[PDB]
Amino acid sequence: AEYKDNLLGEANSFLEVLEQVSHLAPLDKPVLIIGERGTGKELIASRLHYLSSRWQGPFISLNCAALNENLLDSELFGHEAGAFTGAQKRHPGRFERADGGTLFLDELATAPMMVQEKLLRVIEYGELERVGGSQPLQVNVRLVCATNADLPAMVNEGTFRADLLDRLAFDVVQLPPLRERESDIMLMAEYFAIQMCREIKLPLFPGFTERARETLLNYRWPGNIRELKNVVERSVYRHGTSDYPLDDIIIDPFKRR
Amino acid sequence: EYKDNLLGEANSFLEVLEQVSHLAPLDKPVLIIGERGTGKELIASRLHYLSSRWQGPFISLNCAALNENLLDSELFGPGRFERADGGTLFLDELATAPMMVQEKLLRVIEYGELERVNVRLVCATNADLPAMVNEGTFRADLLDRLAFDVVQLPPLRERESDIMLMAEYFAIQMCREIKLPLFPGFTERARETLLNYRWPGNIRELKNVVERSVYRHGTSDYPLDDIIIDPFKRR
Amino acid sequence: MAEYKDNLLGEANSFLEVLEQVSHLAPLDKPVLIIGERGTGKELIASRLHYLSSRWQGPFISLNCAALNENLLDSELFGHEAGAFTGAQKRHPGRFERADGGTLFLDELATAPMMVQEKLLRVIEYGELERVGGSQPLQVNVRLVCATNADLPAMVNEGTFRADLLDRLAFDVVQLPPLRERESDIMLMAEYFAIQMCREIKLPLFPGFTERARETLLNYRWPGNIRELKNVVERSVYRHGTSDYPLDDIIIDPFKRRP
Amino acid sequence: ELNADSIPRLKINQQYAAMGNSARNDADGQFIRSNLQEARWLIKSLESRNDTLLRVSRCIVEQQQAFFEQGEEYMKPMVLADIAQAVEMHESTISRVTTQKYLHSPRGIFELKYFFSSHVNTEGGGEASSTAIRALVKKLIAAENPAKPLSDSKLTSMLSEQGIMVARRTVAKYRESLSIPPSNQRKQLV
Amino acid sequence: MKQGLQLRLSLAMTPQLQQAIRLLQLSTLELQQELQQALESNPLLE
DNA sequence: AGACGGCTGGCACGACTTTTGCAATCGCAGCCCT
DNA sequence: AGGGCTGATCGTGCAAAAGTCGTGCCAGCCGTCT
Numbered sequence A: 001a002e003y004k005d006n007l008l009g010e011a012n013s014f015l016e017v018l019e020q021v022s023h024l025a026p027l028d029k030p031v032l033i034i035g036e037r038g039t040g041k042e043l044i045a046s047r048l049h050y051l052s053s054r055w056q057g058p059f060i061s062l063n064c065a066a067l068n069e070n071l072l073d074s075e076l077f078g079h080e081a082g083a084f085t086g087a088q089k090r091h092p093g094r095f096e097r098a099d100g101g102t103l104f105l106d107e108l109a110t111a112p113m114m115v116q117e118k119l120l121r122v123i124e125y126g127e128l129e130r131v132g133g134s135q136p137l138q139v140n141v142r143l144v145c146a147t148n149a150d151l152p153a154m155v156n157e158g159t160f161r162a163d164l165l166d167r168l169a170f171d172v173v174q175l176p177p178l179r180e181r182e183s184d185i186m187l188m189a190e191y192f193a194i195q196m197c198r199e200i201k202l203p204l205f206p207g208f209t210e211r212a213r214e215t216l217l218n219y220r221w222p223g224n225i226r227e228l229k230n231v232v233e234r235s236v237y238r239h240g241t242s243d244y245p246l247d248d249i250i251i252d253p254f255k256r257r
Numbered sequence B: 001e002y003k004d005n006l007l008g009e010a011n012s013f014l015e016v017l018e019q020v021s022h023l024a025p026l027d028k029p030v031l032i033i034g035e036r037g038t039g040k041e042l043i044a045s046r047l048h049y050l051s052s053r054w055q056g057p058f059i060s061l062n063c064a065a066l067n068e069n070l071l072d073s074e075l076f077g078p079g080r081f082e083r084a085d086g087g088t089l090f091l092d093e094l095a096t097a098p099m100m101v102q103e104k105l106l107r108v109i110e111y112g113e114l115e116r117v118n119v120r121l122v123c124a125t126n127a128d129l130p131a132m133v134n135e136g137t138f139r140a141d142l143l144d145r146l147a148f149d150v151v152q153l154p155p156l157r158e159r160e161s162d163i164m165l166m167a168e169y170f171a172i173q174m175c176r177e178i179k180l181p182l183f184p185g186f187t188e189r190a191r192e193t194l195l196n197y198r199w200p201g202n203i204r205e206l207k208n209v210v211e212r213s214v215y216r217h218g219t220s221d222y223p224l225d226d227i228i229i230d231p232f233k234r235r
Numbered sequence C: 001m002a003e004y005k006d007n008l009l010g011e012a013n014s015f016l017e018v019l020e021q022v023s024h025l026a027p028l029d030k031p032v033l034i035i036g037e038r039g040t041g042k043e044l045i046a047s048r049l050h051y052l053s054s055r056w057q058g059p060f061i062s063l064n065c066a067a068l069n070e071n072l073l074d075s076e077l078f079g080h081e082a083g084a085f086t087g088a089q090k091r092h093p094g095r096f097e098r099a100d101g102g103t104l105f106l107d108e109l110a111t112a113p114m115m116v117q118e119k120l121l122r123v124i125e126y127g128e129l130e131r132v133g134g135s136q137p138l139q140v141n142v143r144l145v146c147a148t149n150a151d152l153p154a155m156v157n158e159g160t161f162r163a164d165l166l167d168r169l170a171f172d173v174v175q176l177p178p179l180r181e182r183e184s185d186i187m188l189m190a191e192y193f194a195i196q197m198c199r200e201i202k203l204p205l206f207p208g209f210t211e212r213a214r215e216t217l218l219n220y221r222w223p224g225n226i227r228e229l230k231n232v233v234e235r236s237v238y239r240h241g242t243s244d245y246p247l248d249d250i251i252i253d254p255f256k257r258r259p
Numbered sequence D: 001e002l003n004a005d006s007i008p009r010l011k012i013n014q015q016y017a018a019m020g021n022s023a024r025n026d027a028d029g030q031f032i033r034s035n036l037q038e039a040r041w042l043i044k045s046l047e048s049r050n051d052t053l054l055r056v057s058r059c060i061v062e063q064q065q066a067f068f069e070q071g072e073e074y075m076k077p078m079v080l081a082d083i084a085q086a087v088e089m090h091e092s093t094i095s096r097v098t099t100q101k102y103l104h105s106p107r108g109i110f111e112l113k114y115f116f117s118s119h120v121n122t123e124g125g126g127e128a129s130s131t132a133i134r135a136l137v138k139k140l141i142a143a144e145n146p147a148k149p150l151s152d153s154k155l156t157s158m159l160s161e162q163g164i165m166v167a168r169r170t171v172a173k174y175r176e177s178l179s180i181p182p183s184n185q186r187k188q189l190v
Numbered sequence E: 001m002k003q004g005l006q007l008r009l010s011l012a013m014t015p016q017l018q019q020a021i022r023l024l025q026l027s028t029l030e031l032q033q034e035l036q037q038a039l040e041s042n043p044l045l046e
Numbered sequence F: 001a002g003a004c005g006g007c008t009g010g011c012a013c014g015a016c017t018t019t020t021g022c023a024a025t026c027g028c029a030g031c032c033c034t
Numbered sequence G: 001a002g003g004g005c006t007g008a009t010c011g012t013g014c015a016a017a018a019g020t021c022g023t024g025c026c027a028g029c030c031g032t033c034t
């Protein structure tokens, strides 16, 4: 398909990252994304998958960290047929999604050491994670990683095997810090404001006060998009009817009065 | 009129009530930032009575000890949201729900076919949902969608001037219930004891303490003197 | 009786003699244990052993060692005859039962459960096993393949590995020449990997390697025997242009800081 | 919806049930009870079969809407297991349902089994229905210069321009299915 | 997951009746002939 | 006028289809054999 | 007088062997240009 870069970073670093992504898109190898909390890494990975030659069939961004147990993540990687009884969902579907597709995960540091070893064994062979009483199926699948934690830090911790870290890390995508980016931050903020003014169907766009924009820039805003969207929603809830430029930030539910 | 349960004379309480009324005219989800006791069920009952569609049925869903088979039964594969009809069922203990359960509930709201409803929504949690998401204890998409508009609630410590009015109303209600002739009155000692009480619970604790004090007194002749919530007391 | 040499690379060092010894030991069906280079090459050794084994000898059953905390592993090893053990309630054959006359490619994962190793000791005791809830035992025959990545005697002295586990296994030890020790086919293996990468990327022509790159490779520690070098070659090819001025620019790995 | 006229319906004989319930003879009453049990089982089986067929047809249409609306060219490559996954019944039940069943729609009358088609690898990663591929091949072949008929290799290249991933042997088989003549035979004087 | 036995509560060999029922749904016009044949034998079905 | 080429048709092999062939264990008790 | 044991009633699948196609692949041949 075609990569979607709506509200792409105006910073030249974002453009260089996009150029590297375009270069690697014809290739078929794992990628590591050094991101931050709400930095936009997974959206960048999805855009790369869109640009990754064909549409690459199914695209799944399941995160092992946001799972009840590591056993559930292993079942998602591969479900042995007849093992245990019952399930919350068809576990083999997650494995089948990578078939004719790529592998995308978020916060891979939380993955169990046994799970990491099983994944490393699968990646080299390509076979299905769970045999289920039969020979595992080698599905043609790519891979992508996105963890804020440093891979060398994990190697020092020893949670990930040396082979796992090496073969897993084929491409590195270092997401620029949200606080560090200023021009890209302003461009993205303007794009988000326009998109909100359109979606919220407000008759007139309030715009943005210079003091309000300066205060927003002064905020650390680690969530390049997540915190940005949260602050946009906080300002939208305090709807000024296109006449109040205060842009009060009510994103923090704990904050009151 | 719903008898105006928990009449909050505080300007903040009035603003919260106005925001709740505005949310009630809408049939869209909203978040209620309040804790058990602090989030008195009387407020939720008044909100339900203030439903935009009076014909609309409200189920007022809450966390229950339902097994996995019971969890599927609560789902269509008969849906739980089907019990309510155009009403904001005030979900309770949403932090206690399972991650799979939370995802299933979120998919039921403005979503479909998450794995490869004619009713409003309401929820309230005593825990820090942003912290739990930062701790990875809840679905970020569910937290974001549910928190369309967070409606904070005042705790017992928040109500200071209205505390006296609430105590008077509770005493009147107890006198009506306990067949007391009227409110015998308070004393400076009783008021000081009530003020010094940190009141960890807001609604249920106040009513329970009032009931215990009334049982201790049991008369409408002598005005109230003092009360305590300790395990034991003596002269 | 087929060659199936596959991507058997890096034999210019004493690895040729290691391969000769492996070929000599191939006809025997006794226990097979190796010592693979830490980080890379154990899979290549296993593939070479499988090629040494007859293609019609049997399936090449490979299992990554895991602790006994997962009852599924116990069911795979011992079997599952009764209900609630594995698969259906019937006699779902385990992984060991799945291998009848085939190679048992063991992994030296150094799993925490010594109980798992103790159970595996009975797996190869007289060629027999009993399933979970198995009313009658079953005598089975299968080939065994093992490897290592650490000092077995050190763990034996330290008690990390069961003494009986080492005694029963390791009929003979096969040592992998280290990458810091082989150092012979670095040019040849690097050229083969570069050719494969160029074919994969559809590179018009071979770019060529500067002498400075060869000197750096000689100075490189190369923790991985045949995988880290291949990964470095792939990373360099990604950052280089075939038959162009960018060919000089070589990237060791994305993990290293950008230039 | 199932054709109301076509679906058979059975009704329990109320007079017979009343006679059997009040039958003076114990043997006659027992025989009536056995007959009633058999008839009830048959009626329940027929109703369940009709309902299962309706549900299977609805599920099939859910995935074949593209072919239903756009036409034969937009036919998704689907298998029996694909339909079995969307329902709770097995592929055996799918085969039993997809047995001598014809459904009428705005497009026309088509057999239930005609929906299922082979999966063909294609450029862009997707898979195509062999029926749709044959339809496209026939459309291309018909719209050709009569003086110079298209070669099967040439047709294969043309379809590869759309991502055939076919070696023209399957194209040859499809042409045989459509009775396409040879390139030499197709050519004629202008 | 965790090893265990039945701790809370929660199949069939279809005989000739249900077996022929499964053998049904093969056709519709032909199914009518078999249905008439059965209705001839069964005296409590109309 | 013997070779190029495209067709066609035979051949084979894993991967989708499918069909038929099974018909488990269960609590009553009175009657017949010992 | 005590043991054997007799038939009532029950049940929308599947799986296992078989078949069977999708696709590719080889062998020849004739229309033709050389």
Ligand SMILES: Nc1ncnc2c1ncn2[C@@H]1O[C@H](COP(=O)(O)OP(=O)(O)O)[C@@H](O)[C@H]1O
Pocket: A004, A005, A006, A007, A008, A009, A038, A039, A040, A041, A042, A043, A044, A106, A225, A226
């Ligand atoms: N270049 C971009 N243009 C438009 N939107 C973007 C861009 N990058 C990120 N986003 C937005 O940021 C949101 C969050 O992205 P991301 O942080 O990658 O997801 P996750 O929370 O899974 O990491 C997405 O919904 C996406 O719309």
Ligand SMILES: Nc1ncnc2c1ncn2[C@@H]1O[C@H](COP(=O)(O)OP(=O)(O)O)[C@@H](O)[C@H]1O
Pocket: A124, A163, C006, C007, C008, C009, C010, C036, C037, C038, C039, C040, C041, C042, C043, C044, C149, C225, C226, C227, C228
């Ligand atoms: N001649 C060769 N042929 C094929 N692969 C090789 C060769 N030399 C090195 N390798 C690579 O070295 C790697 C060794 O990995 P492995 O030994 O499994 O790691 P670990 O020892 O950490 O388990 C293999 O993935 C293989 O691709």
Ligand SMILES: [Mg+2]
Pocket: A042, A106
């Ligand atoms: Mg994310």
Ligand SMILES: [Mg+2]
Pocket: A163, C042
């Ligand atoms: Mg390894």
